[PDB]
Design an enzyme around this catalytic site. Structure first.
Site, PDB file in Angstrom:
ATOM      1  N   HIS A  33      10.142   4.143   4.564  1.00  0.00           N
ATOM      2  CA  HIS A  33       9.357   2.946   4.341  1.00  0.00           C
ATOM      3  C   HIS A  33       9.532   2.394   2.909  1.00  0.00           C
ATOM      4  O   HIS A  33       9.800   1.210   2.737  1.00  0.00           O
ATOM      5  CB  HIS A  33       7.876   3.217   4.657  1.00  0.00           C
ATOM      6  CG  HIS A  33       6.995   2.021   4.507  1.00  0.00           C
ATOM      7  ND1 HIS A  33       7.182   0.859   5.224  1.00  0.00           N
ATOM      8  CD2 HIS A  33       5.907   1.819   3.733  1.00  0.00           C
ATOM      9  CE1 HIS A  33       6.250  -0.009   4.882  1.00  0.00           C
ATOM     10  NE2 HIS A  33       5.445   0.563   4.005  1.00  0.00           N
ATOM     11  N   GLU A  66      11.218  -3.524   4.961  1.00  0.00           N
ATOM     12  CA  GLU A  66      10.060  -2.824   5.574  1.00  0.00           C
ATOM     13  C   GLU A  66       8.737  -3.645   5.543  1.00  0.00           C
ATOM     14  O   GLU A  66       7.685  -3.205   5.017  1.00  0.00           O
ATOM     15  CB  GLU A  66       9.903  -1.490   4.885  1.00  0.00           C
ATOM     16  CG  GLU A  66      10.928  -0.467   5.381  1.00  0.00           C
ATOM     17  CD  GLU A  66      10.553   0.185   6.713  1.00  0.00           C
ATOM     18  OE1 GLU A  66       9.316   0.390   6.964  1.00  0.00           O
ATOM     19  OE2 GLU A  66      11.507   0.531   7.480  1.00  0.00           O
ATOM     20  N   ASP A  85       6.045  -4.418   2.685  1.00  0.00           N
ATOM     21  CA  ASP A  85       4.746  -3.887   3.229  1.00  0.00           C
ATOM     22  C   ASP A  85       3.651  -5.005   3.182  1.00  0.00           C
ATOM     23  O   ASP A  85       3.864  -6.111   3.689  1.00  0.00           O
ATOM     24  CB  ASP A  85       4.353  -2.597   2.432  1.00  0.00           C
ATOM     25  CG  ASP A  85       3.105  -1.857   2.982  1.00  0.00           C
ATOM     26  OD1 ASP A  85       3.262  -0.990   3.883  1.00  0.00           O
ATOM     27  OD2 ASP A  85       1.983  -2.065   2.458  1.00  0.00           O
ATOM     28  N   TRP A  86       2.487  -4.749   2.581  1.00  0.00           N
ATOM     29  CA  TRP A  86       1.396  -5.791   2.542  1.00  0.00           C
ATOM     30  C   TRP A  86       1.729  -6.941   1.605  1.00  0.00           C
ATOM     31  O   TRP A  86       1.266  -8.041   1.814  1.00  0.00           O
ATOM     32  CB  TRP A  86       0.022  -5.166   2.218  1.00  0.00           C
ATOM     33  CG  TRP A  86      -0.602  -4.566   3.431  1.00  0.00           C
ATOM     34  CD1 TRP A  86      -0.661  -3.240   3.766  1.00  0.00           C
ATOM     35  CD2 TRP A  86      -1.212  -5.282   4.523  1.00  0.00           C
ATOM     36  NE1 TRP A  86      -1.276  -3.097   4.988  1.00  0.00           N
ATOM     37  CE2 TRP A  86      -1.597  -4.326   5.485  1.00  0.00           C
ATOM     38  CE3 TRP A  86      -1.465  -6.649   4.777  1.00  0.00           C
ATOM     39  CZ2 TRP A  86      -2.277  -4.675   6.659  1.00  0.00           C
ATOM     40  CZ3 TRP A  86      -2.098  -7.002   5.942  1.00  0.00           C
ATOM     41  CH2 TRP A  86      -2.512  -6.016   6.882  1.00  0.00           C
ATOM     42  N   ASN A 124       0.782  -1.250   0.000  1.00  0.00           N
ATOM     43  CA  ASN A 124       0.000   0.000   0.000  1.00  0.00           C
ATOM     44  C   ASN A 124       0.819   1.308   0.000  1.00  0.00           C
ATOM     45  O   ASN A 124       1.770   1.421   0.775  1.00  0.00           O
ATOM     46  CB  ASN A 124      -0.843   0.003   1.269  1.00  0.00           C
ATOM     47  CG  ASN A 124      -1.983   1.009   1.216  1.00  0.00           C
ATOM     48  OD1 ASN A 124      -2.625   1.177   0.168  1.00  0.00           O
ATOM     49  ND2 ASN A 124      -2.272   1.657   2.359  1.00  0.00           N
TER      50      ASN A 124
HETATM   51 CL   LIG Z   1      -1.382   0.302   5.198  1.00  0.00          CL
END
Ligand SMILES: [Cl-]
Length: 294
Positions: free
Chosen positions: A270, A128, A104-105, A39
């Site tokens: 990030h 990250e 991330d996701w 995201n």
């Molecule tokens: Cl998020």
């Protein structure tokens, strides 16, 4: 410097009634390297990393359901929805053994798939990534308010869906160098119409922060347990100051995760791919050959 183009032919595959777009380059014999964004990004986040790796290995970088150039069904876009579509994506392309490049996701999806398909993972390159954040104190101070606000049905919808604050606000604030407007427009494009920003809102509402939501916290804990005892080769990239994985926690992980090599990227927050894509790409290509044997 860093490139802003996306010179990849589109490939599309029908999965659960919906068309998913993906990048697909490199040789078709050998182990494919599967790239998973999170995201509010897409395959565009891997654009400057893939060209370091495609000379040697098939690169597949899909756009998650509701994102990128993929179709936008009317979903809640819970993690479990991404799990279903991503699982079906991988079977649809007949993937057997894979190497995973995840963020991330994408890293929640990728660790969750690996734990459930351990025999099919030859290695993991991560950066990250998502693991439990047990208390709000353990979330970064500079983003605590922003994410507390995101995690609400009134204010959080306002900011992210109505005012696009994840694309205009959070994304550029978590990249140390300034994104250009060409880059920003490639990130804005899938979400030009506000109603399509549902995944951008549900995602930070799915983060395992402070025990909530209970299902994600448990599923994440289970994949972090698996990872800590898996001998799968792991390559972890980190930056300074970082966001989810600050320097001191990257060092801890280097020691606590089996067969883990860490790489220091320099500055970053990030979205590390946007600050040092060249070292990320080159270090991955470097790392792949020794994964190949049995
Ligand atoms: Cl998020």
């Amino acid at each position: 410097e860093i490139g802003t183009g996306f010179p990849f032919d589109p490939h599309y595959v029908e999965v659960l009634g919906e068309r998913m777009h993906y990048v697909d380059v490199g040789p078709r014999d050998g182990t494919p390297v599967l790239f998973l964004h999170g995201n509010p990004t897409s395959s565009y986040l891997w654009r400057n990393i893939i060209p370091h790796v495609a000379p040697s290995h098939r690169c597949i970088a899909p756009d998650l359901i509701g994102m990128g150039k993929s179709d936008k069904p009317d979903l809640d876009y819970f993690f479990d929805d991404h799990v279903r579509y991503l699982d079906a994506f991988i079977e649809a392309l007949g993937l057997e053994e894979v190497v995973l490049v995840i963020h991330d996701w994408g890293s929640a999806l990728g660790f969750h798939w690996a734990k459930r398909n351990p025999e099919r993972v030859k290695g993991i390159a991560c950066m990250e990534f998502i693991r439990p954040i047990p208390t709000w104190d353990e979330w970064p101070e500079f983003a605590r308010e922003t994410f507390q606000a995101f995690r609400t049905a009134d204010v959080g919808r306002e900011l992210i869906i109505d005012q696009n604050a994840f694309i205009e606000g959070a994304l550029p604030k978590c990249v140390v160098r300034p994104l250009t407007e060409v880059e920003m427009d490639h990130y804005r494009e899938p979400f030009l119409k506000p109603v399509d920003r549902e995944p951008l809102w549900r995602f930070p509402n799915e983060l395992p922060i402070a025990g909530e939501p209970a299902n994600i916290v448990a599923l994440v804990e289970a994949y972090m347990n698996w990872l800590h005892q898996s001998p799968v080769p792991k390559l972890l990239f980190w930056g300074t100051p970082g966001v989810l994985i600050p320097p001191a926690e990257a060092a801890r992980l280097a020691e606590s995760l089996p067969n883990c090599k860490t790489v220091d990227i320099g500055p970053g927050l990030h979205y590390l791919q946007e600050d040092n894509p060249d070292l990320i790409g080159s270090e991955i290509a470097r790392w792949l050959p020794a994964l190949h044997h049995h």
